[PDB]
Structure 1
């Protein structure tokens, strides 16, 4: 298909999502709830762009890049005023109740939420009220769990239920008191629970084995190897 982003013509696939088509072109659209291997939901609204139908249009409509098909004839815009300030408002709503504990966090320089907060360009805080706190759970010797860092993007339960097939983790909660985990305290019996460290964009599900003797990502000397 042929789409037009930022007043520029691009040739992307027809049956795929607009978010993955824009990310395949090297463009930058922030996202929290979409995963390439888990499909697309509307748990966040971070991938918002402004869509136009005709070649020339004034108002348009704020749509989600992970809910819009990359069809022939779409004229979407990314770095306009309204979509950028809406994405800044969404990251502001995510920092409305987020604990001030980044240097004592196992993600740190490996955190997607930091990257998408800096990418949207939000530094000034206008929230002056109290935050939201949760208790913790013991999820075995591998997955350290702490719920304060969460942004309710539903990627963990989506992976753990639809993809991994595990029957342990899930959503228990309400409007704002939404919880992601286990109804009791115990080890996650699924054999794929270790992918929650990279599935979660926040520091909720973290590597306990890496939490012991911990170092940051930039201090890590990496290598490509085989298990």
Structure 2
């Protein structure tokens, strides 16, 4: 009764139908590298990083959005698994500017941690890397449109939770821009809650911008004030 046998590298685990490959791996202790998934947001197969190999499967699938049938077996250390992840990692780091000092999420990036633990080292593509003009999304959120890896996590967040619905994609192909078409500022509730969601340092905090760096700050538990929710 809704207890599905999947094997993580041979080891059995019972999984509900409709739940994905990734929630099974989080059940057994594994993680899959991922960008356009987020555990408390919507699900789409955009970012292509979460590719994974199944035993007896000549078609490599994206593990963020797979309905899980009965009796699988999932390779998370195999050959073409790492080959596909290193390929996609060399793809993502081509149209991204050399800004890791002047970025604000230098200690708390995601491209950096996955490019260490899952990426290649000797790059290619000697000439290119176009850049995109920015525009202020508001007075409170500093915006650089160049470091956007076009992961589409802010957009679906806006479309399903914020309800303002002024943040879309324009253009096609390489030339795709994210954000606002009519240059209208974004001043609504929870507009500061897009600096925790943008997984690269594109949409960052305007007042915080250049006052610290994450590897030098020690943390402390605290409670939300000026509310009643905490």
TM-score (structure 1 length as normaliser): 0.90
Identify if the C-alpha distance between structure 1 residues 127 and 20 changes in structure 2 by more than 3 Å, giving closer, same or farther: farther
Counterpart residue number, 1:31:
34
Matches for 1:156-171 after TM superposition, within 5 Å: 156-171=154-169
Q: Tell me, in whole angstroms, the C-alpha distance in 1 between the residues paired with 2:162 and 2:24.
A: 25
Q: How far apart are residue 112 of structure 1 and its match?
A: 1.6
Counterpart residue number, 2:227:
none
What SS does the corresponding residue of 2:175 show, helix, strand or coil? coil
Q: Tell me, in whole angstroms, the C-alpha distance in 1 between the residues paired with 2:210 and 2:112.
A: 23
Q: Tell me, in whole angstroms, the C-alpha distance in 2 between the residues paired with 1:16 and 1:145.
A: 35
Q: How far apart are residue 18 of structure 1 and its match?
A: 1.1
Counterpart residue number, 2:131:
133
Q: Which runs of 5+ in 2 are unaligned?
A: 225-230
Deviations 1:126-172 (A, max 9, x none): 22121121001111122111111111111111111122222221111
8 Å Cα contact 1:30/1:119 also seen in 2:
no
Q: Which runs of 5+ in 1 are unaligned?
A: none
Counterpart residue number, 2:78:
80
Counterpart residue number, 2:228:
none
What SS does the corresponding residue of 1:61 show, helix, strand or coil? coil
Q: Tell me, in whole angstroms, the C-alpha distance in 2 between the residues paired with 1:201 and 1:143.
A: 15
Q: Does 1:106 align with 2:104?
A: yes
Deviations 1:45-89 (A, max 9, x none): 11100124xxxx3x5421111121233201121211112111111
Q: How far apart are residue 212 of structure 1 and its match?
A: 4.3
Deviations 1:81-109 (A, max 9, x none): 11211111111111111101101101101
Identify if the C-alpha distance between structure 1 residues 166 and 24 changes in structure 2 by more than 3 Å, giving closer, same or farther: farther
Matches for 1:65-214 after TM superposition, within 5 Å: 65-213=63-211
Q: Tell me, in whole angstroms, the C-alpha distance in 2 between the residues paired with 1:65 and 1:9.
A: 18
What SS does the corresponding residue of 1:178 show, helix, strand or coil? strand
8 Å Cα contact 1:168/1:189 also seen in 2:
no
Q: How far apart are residue 186 of structure 1 and its match?
A: 4.4
Identify if the C-alpha distance between structure 1 residues 7 and 128 changes in structure 2 by more than 3 Å, giving closer, same or farther: farther
What SS does the corresponding residue of 2:60 show, helix, strand or coil? strand
Q: How many pairs were matched up?
A: 221
TM-score (structure 2 length as normaliser): 0.89
